[PDB]
Paper text:
The [name] APPA derived from [name] exhibits exceptional overall properties, including a high specific activity (3960 U/mg), excellent pH stability within the range of pH 2.5 to 10.0, and resistance to pepsin and trypsin digestion at 37 °C for 2 h, making it highly suitable for application in the feed industry. By hydrolyzing phytate—a compound that inhibits nutrient absorption found in animal feed—into inorganic phosphoric acid, it effectively reduces phosphorus excretion while enhancing mineral and protein digestion and absorption. However, the issue of heat resistance has emerged as a critical bottleneck hindering the industrial application of [name] due to the technical requirement of instantaneous high temperatures during feed pelletizing processes. The active site within the two domains typically consists of two conserved motifs: RHGXRXP in the N-terminal and HD in the C-terminal, with His and Asp serving as catalytic residues.
Residue numbers in the entry: 10 to 418
The structure:
Amino acid sequence: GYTLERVVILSRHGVRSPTKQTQLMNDVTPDTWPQWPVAAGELTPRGAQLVTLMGGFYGDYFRSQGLLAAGCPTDADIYAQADVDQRTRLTGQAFLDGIAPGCGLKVHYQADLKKVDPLFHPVDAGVCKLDSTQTHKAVEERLGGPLSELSKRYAKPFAQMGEILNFAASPYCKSLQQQGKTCDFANFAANKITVNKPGTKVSLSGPLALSSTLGEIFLLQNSQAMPDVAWHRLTGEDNWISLLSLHNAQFDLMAKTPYIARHKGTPLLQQIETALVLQRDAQGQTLPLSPQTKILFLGGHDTNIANIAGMLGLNWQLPQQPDNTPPGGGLVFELWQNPDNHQRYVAVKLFYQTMGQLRNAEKLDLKNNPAGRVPVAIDGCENSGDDKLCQLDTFQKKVAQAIEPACHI
């Protein structure tokens, strides 16, 4: 077919413990949240193992495509840059361990682990600011109305989440009833967006935000192979899809909303595009990539993937993976060249482990049990053929149009 020339993987970190267990998260259920074997927000050992399995699949796939030779690549061939978080650094390392076992590759990352990496969090870092009014306006435009619409749009998932929590028996519900309120989970509080004064943080609070977090946690519990997921009250693929639709909706609103996405994702989009075509001195190419670079692995977060998706108009649904930005899942950019006419193409795929592949820690390979690999259509691109190929020149213009120039690094 075509020749796979270069790949950039924007990977979410692997399975992690919840980053935060708020009073609200405790109060919305009478049940006890299962504890995790690692500190909050850290990649679990099982998370690492799953990422390594995924790295083995990547290795299998890229070698089958001739992009990697057999044997050990070097940093010249494969570069893994991770965010400063432990979860992303170890995800990058687990990726290298799986794609190149015994090859001594080491994940790279900003040396100062104490500060945000502006590649992964430019807004947090202060590279550019979100305007509160534009942010509220952009999110509502994205939603098609004010956040109060969410309780109607997601009434069934919200009710489902309330049932899974046994919200009606929760301390939060008794507090609501104390105040003469009903225990309508969808409306236990207002959905509020808060941009802090400096414009470096945007927060969603309220039922959607909480439900996004809780749904993700259930999925992480499930992905961790925990024995009790959601107190055994969450089973069935559609129920998983439905419940996680709250999470995906939250990520759509708070990370895919182009205004937000372009401010938070511009350095990553520029890093992805410049690494993909290997324009090593281009703006936004921040890494010491070798001219021989075949794979750039970016160890980031679900928000990063969603920001990129928002910037490029990417929308997907993953068979057997209700989280659109699943643990260890990678937004994979592939540079293809048609040997017959030398036309070059960009393909975007979401590589991911299904729920079962995660939960059962299944060995991934090409013939028996591949990772999921969902082609993703790009706004403004040719989206040609079943794999939604974009002509390279078209992809580069789309990237140039999607970036917020004030947000580059």
